[PDB]
């Protein structure tokens, strides 16, 4: 008589109630045990009284006992082997539901006797009658193959998986190809066994006559496939093309992944390329009218789709304007997709909503909008003066979280156009109407350093920052030298106490080796040959690209194949979350 | 010094909150949730002292109620833990027995006991008999 618990201020024994003949009281007792297990108790001292006492009715009590076993399979095998023989003697039961439940609760046990005592009930239910038994069998095959270890009959398990790929039931063959993709997570010798001219047709017939869940795994394993034929490829695209399934988002984005990775043709001469461009846009537009979470996932994938191929949602931008009853993530991503799709024919529709979004209440959304105005200024050619005037009017309101983000996109406009805006500096640097965050500080310091012919009192504005030399800004030297490598030559015996003070601060005061190496590279250059320093530092620079907030092309080609994956939502490399 | 005294049940409500330092309204809304998320997860087989950034929050669990007294890391944690238990015993002996329903229904007596026990981050009276005599004299 051990592990005595209470009931609302009473005293009663659980083990006598478990061993009693009252099956309803035993069910209530094991329900209380499972409730304690869910809330987080240590009920592991009842295992030989809940396992070996399996003498009552089959279905509900056996399901609860198997739930207890699949929850506490990480326990000791000395306690787990009390009735494990009668546990694994369940592949000859008359109920295939009981057999499938026994297989599904035996697969989660990572014990040393698993590969020597579970291969016979697994192989005794592979070529079974009920398809759910084969479904659970392939699930447990993938579960045992998750360790990727050489089992007792692992080659026979892989051969049975290859046989189950070409079988009758569509959910069974979908789960089998999903298990092949799961064992294909590593790089074995038999990685991605295609067996094209029969398995492709079998997978297409399974996709045509499948349910609303196996299509995701089928298209997931189809996404990594890369053929080389033409008529076979067109038949694959024709079978893939009808996709408006009831699972409104996952199947659609997996089919978009298949169609975008399945793009190996002429990018301007293939008529079927234009057919696919016409095909992708009704799902990529009607995908947004659902629940907010799959809407956010769809927007994060549509951002990568637009960054790679801009000619998909180019003619449809009215579905990307933000309404007033959306959450913050949809509100940000619709804005970013809108300012990426701001073309040369919708600027009047874009700019009114852009100047309207600046008066909102979400602080990060207002920051994204005041960066978005400058990004639209970089994008549109004949709107930069109006957007510069709009940014100056927003700065003149003297808002702390608006000026510190507006001066960065103003610096981006100055970098894109180096001659047409030589009048904003003497006002904007003279304002400094905040205590700027380091991005705005770097923007201010670079704007002061460049264009030095019109900011000739820059020594005071640089020495205001030069005293407090504690931030992450190497611009205070790499922009000081690029201007006072010519102003110090035009005015000798002048600003030596700047072009040597910042080098003495970057030589033996800054502990950062990057800043120290920049200081030594500058100090060994301008102190030897001023014409060479003017040729190296003050050379002409090329203009930046039009699309500002881009990712690297290698990471974009990485995220092309992972459109349905979580790396598309995180916008990170897939080795950033292991 | 005592920064705050909290009575939090396991459901999530706050029954008694005394704040001796200068906290804002958002700070008072955030520190209650942080105290709940730190305290109401650890079981009885752990310690009774938790650290937040520089805190030494001392908690006990009396029948679903969670008594928390915060301090900085300079003072005797067992002394403040037994101060918590002495305050719970004072609230017990004010009645014949006490619970969460009694602490809700007699909060005007609870604040009287707290103001006659703790003040300005320190302890006012270590004893219990004089506090019971003061409560019986103020009962009229």
């Amino acid at each position: 008589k051990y592990f005595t618990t209470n009931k609302k201020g009473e005293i009663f024994e659980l083990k006598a109630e478990l061993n009693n003949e009252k099956k309803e009281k035993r069910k209530e007792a094991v329900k209380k045990v499972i409730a304690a297990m869910t809330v987080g108790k240590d009920v592991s001292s009842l295992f030989p009284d809940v396992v070996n006492c399996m003498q009552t009715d089959n279905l509900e009590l056996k399901k609860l006992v198997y739930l207890y076993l699949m929850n506490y399979a990480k326990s000791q095998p000395d306690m787990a082997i009390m009735a494990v023989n009668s546990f694994v003697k369940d592949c000859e039961d008359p109920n295939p539901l009981i057999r499938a439940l026994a297989v599904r609760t035996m697969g989660c046990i990572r014990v040393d006797k698993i590969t020597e005592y579970l291969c016979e009930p697994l192989r005794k239910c592979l070529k079974d009658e009920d398809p759910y038994v084969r479904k659970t069998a392939a699930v447990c095959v993938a579960k045992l193959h998750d360790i990727n270890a050489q089992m007792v009959e692992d080659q026979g398990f892989l051969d049975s998986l290859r046989d189950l790929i070409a079988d009758s039931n569509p959910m069974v063959v979908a789960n089998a190809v999903a298990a092949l993709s799961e064992i294909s997570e590593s790089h074995p010798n038999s990685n991605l066994l295609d067996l094209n001219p029969q398995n492709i047709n079998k997978l297409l017939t399974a996709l045509n006559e499948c349910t609303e869940w196996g299509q995701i795994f089928i298209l997931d394993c189809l996404s990594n496939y890369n053929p080389k034929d033409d008529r076979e490829a067109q038949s694959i695209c024709e079978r893939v093309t009808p996709r408006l399934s009831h699972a409104n988002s996952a199947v659609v984005l997996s089919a978009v992944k298949v169609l975008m990775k399945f793009l190996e043709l002429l990018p301007k001469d293939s008529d079927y390329y234009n057919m696919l461009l016409k095909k992708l846009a009704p799902p990529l537009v009607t995908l947004l009218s659902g629940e907010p979470e799959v809407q956010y996932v769809a927007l994060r994938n549509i951002n990568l789709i637009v960054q790679k191929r801009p000619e998909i949602l180019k003619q449809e931008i009215k579905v990307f304007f933000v309404k007033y009853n959306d959450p913050i993530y949809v509100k940000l991503e619709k804005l970013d997709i809108m300012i990426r799709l701001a073309s040369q024919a919708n600027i009047a529709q874009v700019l009114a909503e852009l100047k309207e979004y600046a008066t909102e209440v979400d602080v990060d959304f207002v920051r994204k909008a005041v960066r978005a105005i400058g990004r639209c200024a970089i994008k549109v050619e004949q709107s930069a003066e109006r957007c510069v005037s709009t940014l100056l009017d927003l700065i003149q309101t003297k808002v702390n979280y608006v000026v510190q983000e507006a001066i960065v996109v103003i610096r981006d406009i100055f970098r894109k156009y180096p001659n047409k805006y030589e009048s904003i500096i003497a006002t904007l640097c003279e304002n400094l109407d905040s205590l700027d965050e380091p991005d705005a500080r770097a923007a201010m310091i670079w704007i002061v350093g460049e264009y030095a012919e019109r900011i000739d009192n820059a020594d005071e504005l640089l020495e205001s920052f030069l005293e407090g030399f504690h931030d992450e800004s190497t611009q205070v030297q790499l922009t000081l030298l690029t201007a006072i490598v010519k102003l110090f030559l035009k005015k000798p015996s002048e600003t030596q106490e700047l072009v040597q003070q910042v080098l003495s601060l970057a030589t033996q005061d800054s502990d950062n080796p990057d800043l120290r190496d920049r200081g030594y590279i500058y100090w060994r250059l301008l102190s030897t040959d001023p014409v060479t320093a003017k040729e190296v530092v003050l050379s002409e620079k090329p203009l930046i690209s039009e699309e500002t907030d881009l990712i690297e092309p290698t990471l974009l080609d990485e995220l092309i194949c992972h459109i349905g994956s979580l790396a598309s939502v995180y916008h990170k490399p897939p080795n950033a979350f292991v | 010094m005592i920064r705050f005294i909290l009575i939090q049940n396991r459901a999530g409500k706050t029954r008694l909150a005394k704040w001796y330092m200068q906290f804002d309204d958002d700070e008072k809304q955030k520190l209650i949730e942080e105290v709940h998320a730190v305290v109401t997860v650890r079981d009885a087989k752990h310690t009774n002292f938790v650290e937040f950034r520089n805190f030494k929050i001392i908690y006990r669990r009396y029948a679903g109620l969670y008594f928390c007294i915060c301090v900085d890391v300079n003072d005797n944690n067992l002394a403040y833990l037994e101060a918590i238990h002495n305050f719970v015993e004072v609230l017990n002996e004010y009645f014949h027995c006490v619970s969460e329903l009694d602490l809700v229904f007699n909060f005007y007596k609870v604040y009287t006991v707290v103001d006659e026990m703790f003040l300005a981050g320190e302890i006012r009276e270590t004893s219990q008999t004089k506090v019971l005599k003061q409560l019986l004299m103020l009962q009229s």
């Binding site: 609302k8 201020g9 009473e10 | 027995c97 006490v98 619970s99 329903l101 009694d102």
Partner: peptide, 10 residues
Amino acid sequence: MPMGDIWKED
């Protein structure tokens, strides 16, 4: 023939 403990305050 035992009785029940006083668990609740009346």
